[PDB]
Design a protein around this motif. Structure first.
Motif, mmCIF file in Angstrom:
data_model
loop_
_atom_site.group_PDB
_atom_site.id
_atom_site.type_symbol
_atom_site.label_atom_id
_atom_site.label_comp_id
_atom_site.label_asym_id
_atom_site.label_seq_id
_atom_site.Cartn_x
_atom_site.Cartn_y
_atom_site.Cartn_z
ATOM 1 N N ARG A 1 12.041 23.024 15.443
ATOM 2 C CA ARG A 1 12.768 22.220 14.464
ATOM 3 C C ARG A 1 12.492 22.687 13.036
ATOM 4 O O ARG A 1 13.398 22.687 12.188
ATOM 5 C CB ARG A 1 12.422 20.746 14.654
ATOM 6 C CG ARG A 1 12.934 20.212 15.981
ATOM 7 C CD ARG A 1 12.510 18.788 16.259
ATOM 8 N NE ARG A 1 13.142 18.291 17.476
ATOM 9 C CZ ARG A 1 12.978 17.071 17.967
ATOM 10 N NH1 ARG A 1 12.202 16.184 17.369
ATOM 11 N NH2 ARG A 1 13.612 16.733 19.086
ATOM 12 N N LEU A 2 11.257 23.106 12.753
ATOM 13 C CA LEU A 2 10.944 23.656 11.437
ATOM 14 C C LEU A 2 11.723 24.939 11.175
ATOM 15 O O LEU A 2 12.208 25.164 10.059
ATOM 16 C CB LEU A 2 9.442 23.907 11.318
ATOM 17 C CG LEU A 2 8.606 22.761 10.751
ATOM 18 C CD1 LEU A 2 7.133 23.124 10.760
ATOM 19 C CD2 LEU A 2 9.064 22.410 9.349
ATOM 20 N N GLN A 3 11.844 25.798 12.192
ATOM 21 C CA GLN A 3 12.641 27.011 12.035
ATOM 22 C C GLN A 3 14.096 26.674 11.733
ATOM 23 O O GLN A 3 14.725 27.312 10.878
ATOM 24 C CB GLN A 3 12.539 27.872 13.293
ATOM 25 C CG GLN A 3 11.546 29.020 13.194
ATOM 26 C CD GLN A 3 11.841 29.958 12.038
ATOM 27 O OE1 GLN A 3 12.619 30.902 12.175
ATOM 28 N NE2 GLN A 3 11.208 29.711 10.896
ATOM 29 N N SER A 4 14.645 25.674 12.426
ATOM 30 C CA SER A 4 16.022 25.264 12.158
ATOM 31 C C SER A 4 16.188 24.795 10.714
ATOM 32 O O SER A 4 17.153 25.167 10.029
ATOM 33 C CB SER A 4 16.439 24.164 13.132
ATOM 34 O OG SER A 4 16.511 24.658 14.456
ATOM 35 N N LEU A 5 15.245 23.978 10.233
ATOM 36 C CA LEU A 5 15.331 23.483 8.861
ATOM 37 C C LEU A 5 15.260 24.623 7.848
ATOM 38 O O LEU A 5 16.023 24.648 6.871
ATOM 39 C CB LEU A 5 14.220 22.468 8.600
ATOM 40 C CG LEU A 5 14.536 21.007 8.921
ATOM 41 C CD1 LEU A 5 13.378 20.114 8.518
ATOM 42 C CD2 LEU A 5 15.816 20.571 8.235
ATOM 43 N N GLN A 6 14.347 25.573 8.063
ATOM 44 C CA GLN A 6 14.216 26.695 7.137
ATOM 45 C C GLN A 6 15.482 27.543 7.113
ATOM 46 O O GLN A 6 15.924 27.990 6.044
ATOM 47 C CB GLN A 6 13.002 27.543 7.512
ATOM 48 C CG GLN A 6 12.680 28.652 6.523
ATOM 49 C CD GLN A 6 12.244 28.123 5.171
ATOM 50 O OE1 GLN A 6 13.003 28.158 4.202
ATOM 51 N NE2 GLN A 6 11.015 27.630 5.098
ATOM 52 N N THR A 7 16.081 27.777 8.285
ATOM 53 C CA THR A 7 17.331 28.529 8.334
ATOM 54 C C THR A 7 18.429 27.821 7.551
ATOM 55 O O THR A 7 19.166 28.457 6.780
ATOM 56 C CB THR A 7 17.757 28.736 9.788
ATOM 57 O OG1 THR A 7 16.723 29.431 10.494
ATOM 58 C CG2 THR A 7 19.039 29.546 9.862
ATOM 59 N N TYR A 8 18.545 26.501 7.726
ATOM 60 C CA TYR A 8 19.553 25.750 6.986
ATOM 61 C C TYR A 8 19.343 25.878 5.481
ATOM 62 O O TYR A 8 20.304 26.083 4.725
ATOM 63 C CB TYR A 8 19.530 24.281 7.409
ATOM 64 C CG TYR A 8 20.400 23.386 6.558
ATOM 65 C CD1 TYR A 8 21.771 23.327 6.758
ATOM 66 C CD2 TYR A 8 19.851 22.601 5.554
ATOM 67 C CE1 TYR A 8 22.569 22.515 5.983
ATOM 68 C CE2 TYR A 8 20.642 21.786 4.774
ATOM 69 C CZ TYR A 8 22.000 21.747 4.992
ATOM 70 O OH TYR A 8 22.791 20.935 4.217
#
Ligand SMILES: *[C@@H]1O[C@H](CO)[C@@H](O)[C@H](O)[C@H]1NC(C)=O
Lengths: 49, 100, 49
Positions: free
Chosen positions: A41-48
């Motif tokens: 989920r942290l990776q998803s947030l950083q990508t966004y």
């Protein structure tokens, strides 16, 4: 919409629901399961961002 | 021993006593092994007799069926929001304002 | 499941997917019991993978 839909991915864990993992299994493996979910989920947030 | 976990009534589990059903306030709920937090209200969904719980576009459980009475309950989170603090410099004053 | 340590000292008790430790809180649809007899050297064969 992509950010919202990325919340149903298990990321290699037994389940995508935190409550099920915490209530169905012991802390020693719950640590690794929640770590996997949190990292995904942290990776998803950083990508966004 | 093999355990079956599906979207079923799931009528095999331990000796845990049930309590009363309270609505219209943020509470902790445990609906047949399913734990969560939020306010439960009367739901106006056209559930079918074989269906147990609903789902939303955000792929999460937002409706449940009471395992005692044939009633559909909508689950919503309790109140939430962000807080901003408006201040001049501390070199000027210590008064602040709050924006919810 | 609380009353299960009342037999001869168990030599194998391995649980996959659920922690046995005071976790009779989970509700299941159905339970299947498969009973048989093997030799001691074959007990390790009864496991995933
Ligand atoms: C027992 O459970 C059944 C399930 O449908 C329900 O109809 C009945 O009202 C329940 N009885 C009590 C006393 O809650």
């Amino acid at each position: 919409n992509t950010l919202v839909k990325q919340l149903s991915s298990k990321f290699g864990a037994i389940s995508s629901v935190l409550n099920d993992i915490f209530s169905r299994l012991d802390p020693p493996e719950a640590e690794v399961q929640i770590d996997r979910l949190i990292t995904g989920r942290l990776q998803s947030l950083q990508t966004y961002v | 021993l093999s355990f079956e976990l599906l979207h079923a009534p799931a009528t095999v589990c331990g000796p845990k006593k049930s309590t009363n059903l309270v609505k219209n306030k943020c509470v902790n709920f445990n609906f047949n092994g399913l734990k969560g937090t939020g306010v439960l209200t009367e739901s106006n969904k056209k559930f079918l007799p074989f269906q147990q719980f609903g789902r939303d576009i955000a792929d999460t459980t937002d409706a449940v069926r009471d395992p005692q009475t044939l009633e559909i309950l909508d689950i919503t989170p309790c109140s939430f929001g962000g807080v901003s603090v408006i201040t001049p410099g501390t070199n000027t004053s210590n008064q602040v304002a709050v924006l919810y | 499941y609380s009353v299960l340590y009342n037999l001869a000292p168990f030599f194998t008790f391995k649980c996959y997917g659920v922690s046995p430790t005071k976790l009779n809180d989970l509700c299941f649809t159905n339970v299947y019991a498969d009973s048989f007899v093997i030799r001691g050297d074959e007990v390790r064969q009864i496991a995933p993978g």
